[PDB]
């Protein structure tokens, strides 16, 4: 299907938009794309199910109750089959969601300014300097809270790169491509964002059965406040 | 210090010696964060809603990570409670703060930014004195007690493995004279020479030397050296302005005998 | 009041700031000074006097309101004259608890 | 956001109306002084600042800030004086003796405290340009005399530093 999909879309990319003996083939195209990722659904939910009903003689063994959140977790998708299958689901459309974000990463970084908040900074820098009457006030702080604790507006210039940074960042996170979202993110000059995208992590830490070499401790042992903010 | 810690109680086993220096430190720490309690709230009192900046400071001070959080917050600079809540346990965290101020130090940006903002950061970032591109010297430990001190030298200028003894070598580098820079931290004083206002003139290195320590600081000098002297540790004027009060000094030599110290000479005894 | 006739320097009080010949700028004065006798264990002020005591403090909250300018609730004399008005808010409610009691006992 | 004037006037005047006496309203001064300050309000700043010296004689932070009020008036022997009784409540402040060497360098050269002062600061600081610089301008207004002690000061300081240009043009 993939082979046969690449082909047809090298065609309808090749072609000038209005002559009505292509929209049939972008509607084939795009019944052969169903079907292809319709494919990669069937294989990713009969593998499960196939391999679950080999294991199921196994008694699945209890979480020890000073078990790390990851640790619970672990044995949660060990054990149900419902949670497992769904998130298969959701890996499955992650997969098609990042197949169409493509070559699209590369256009970004012809827009992405070094420095958050560049006009903004530059407005208020050039406020600094001569008092000159009659422009919009703008945020004094630059701050990601000082335009809602101000009640004030960014330039509209950032207002603008913010949006559309922001909807890359959701057709990334959409994409399941998490970390090319907190990568983006510290281009961009926002690592604070980058640093809230972490949150989710769930606690582990590896130490407390008292292994061998020291390693790292991975999540936030607050991922229940995070969540809450 | 010395005294039974019921989370080394809680094992079968004996614990090892890394466990052992390791609740001591979290120990020590808890003495730190009480000892700054009281202070802690009376400053944060005094500077209300529009000095936000120095309360969170003063609560970073104190250990306080949470309720600086929650400032931070509900005075409305969610960027900085956004940074104080990453602040636990990441070292990478501390290394982009100081990747951040080396930034705005080569753009000269840092002149532009408030001195107590600059200060949080250099505290976030375990640096205890910072240079701004315009030559003004921001010192972290110009505001703290001793003790403050002390505390934010373990929390955040040492990594979270690093001894009490190595907490007090830094320490007692950070108000001597040496080649590399100005003395940045206060002198550990007794309390009743706290609020003295010893002028420094410009002769600091032979004052010194006659300048009595606080008897804590003589009693973490112990700990980290078990052959410390105990006729300056045991000396009243190390905690009281009378000299004839031996309260103290005769019932920490009883303890300090109960903990096997026996170096004091029989005529001190 | 220096002679503990305590009633009849309430009632002058009373006339004094329902008599509006007191400055505006003077009534949180008088309102304090009212305070000890708002607090004694005798119910010195009736029902009707606390109210009008209670009209009076709302009054000047009012009057303060509509001479504040929006570009000045910002310097650090706004903080003790709230807490005194709290003071005499609790003060003041207490009091009518009392008078309430007493007054109502009196006519069963 | 630098608050507003409006803003720190109720935040200290709450502050004011919560201290119980005189002397504790004065305790509050210098950190009235500072918010003064951030708001370019020096006048406001000049009143909290010596409100609060006047409880707090002996705080040098306090003569040192009142000092840095008055030189940014313009009023250079004032912030002179304040930053005098700075230094001789806490003399570590090594940076204070230079800043009232250029001020009274500024203000009067043939005035018989800028070589006391230049004098004083070359002794913290050996081999400082600024020193150099407060030198050179002091023996400049001296004539024949001024020539030969000039003389003497540019070979002394190109023996230390034989590459500044500066140094180089000036002999």
Known sequence: CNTQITLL??????????????????????????????????????????????????????????????????????????????????????????????DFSDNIEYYAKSVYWENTLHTLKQRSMLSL??????????????????????????????????????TLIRAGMTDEAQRLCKRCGQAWRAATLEGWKLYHDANINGGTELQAVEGNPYRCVWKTC | LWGQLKELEASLDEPNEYVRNLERRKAFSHWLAHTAEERIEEEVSLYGPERHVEAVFSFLTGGRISDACRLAQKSGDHRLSLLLSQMVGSQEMRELISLQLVDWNKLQVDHYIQEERLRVFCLLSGTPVWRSSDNRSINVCSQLDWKRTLAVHLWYMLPPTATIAQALRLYERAFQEHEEGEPYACYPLPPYLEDCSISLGDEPSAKFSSLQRDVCVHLLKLYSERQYDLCQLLDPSSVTPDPLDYRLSWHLWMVLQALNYTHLSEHRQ | YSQEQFSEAASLLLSLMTARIAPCSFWLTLLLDALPLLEQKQVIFSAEQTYELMRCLEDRMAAKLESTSPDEIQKQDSSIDNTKVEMLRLALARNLARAIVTEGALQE | MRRSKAEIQRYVENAQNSASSPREKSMKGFLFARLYYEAKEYELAKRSVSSYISVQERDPKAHRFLGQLFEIEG??????????????????????????????????????????????ASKLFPGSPEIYRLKEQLLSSQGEAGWNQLFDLIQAELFARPNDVYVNLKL
Do not use: H
């Open chain 1, 9 to 102: 879309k090298k065609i309808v990319k090749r072609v000038t938009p209005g002559q009505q003996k292509f929209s049939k083939t972008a509607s084939i195209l795009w019944l052969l794309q169903q079907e292809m990722v319709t494919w990669r659904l069937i294989a990713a939910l009969y593998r499960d199910r196939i391999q679950s009903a080999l294991e199921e003689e196994n008694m699945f063994e209890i979480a020890a109750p000073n078990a790390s959140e990851k640790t619970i977790v672990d044995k949660l998708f060990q054990r149900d089959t419902l949670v497992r299958q769904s998130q298969l689901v959701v890996d499955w459309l992650e997969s098609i969601a990042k197949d169409e974000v493509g």
């Open chain 1, 133 to 170: 009457g009659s422009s919009r006030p703008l945020v004094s702080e630059l701050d990601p809270d000082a335009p809602i604790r101000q009640k004030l507006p960014l330039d509209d210039l950032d207002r603008e790169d913010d949006i559309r940074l922001l909807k890359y960042l959701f």
């Open chain 4, 75 to 120: 009023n250079v022997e004032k912030a002179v004086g304040c930053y005098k009784r700075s230094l001789e409540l806490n003399p570590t402040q090594k940076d204070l003796t230079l800043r009232i060497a250029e001020l009274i360098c500024t203000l009067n050269i043939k005035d018989g405290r800028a070589e006391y002062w230049v004098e004083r």
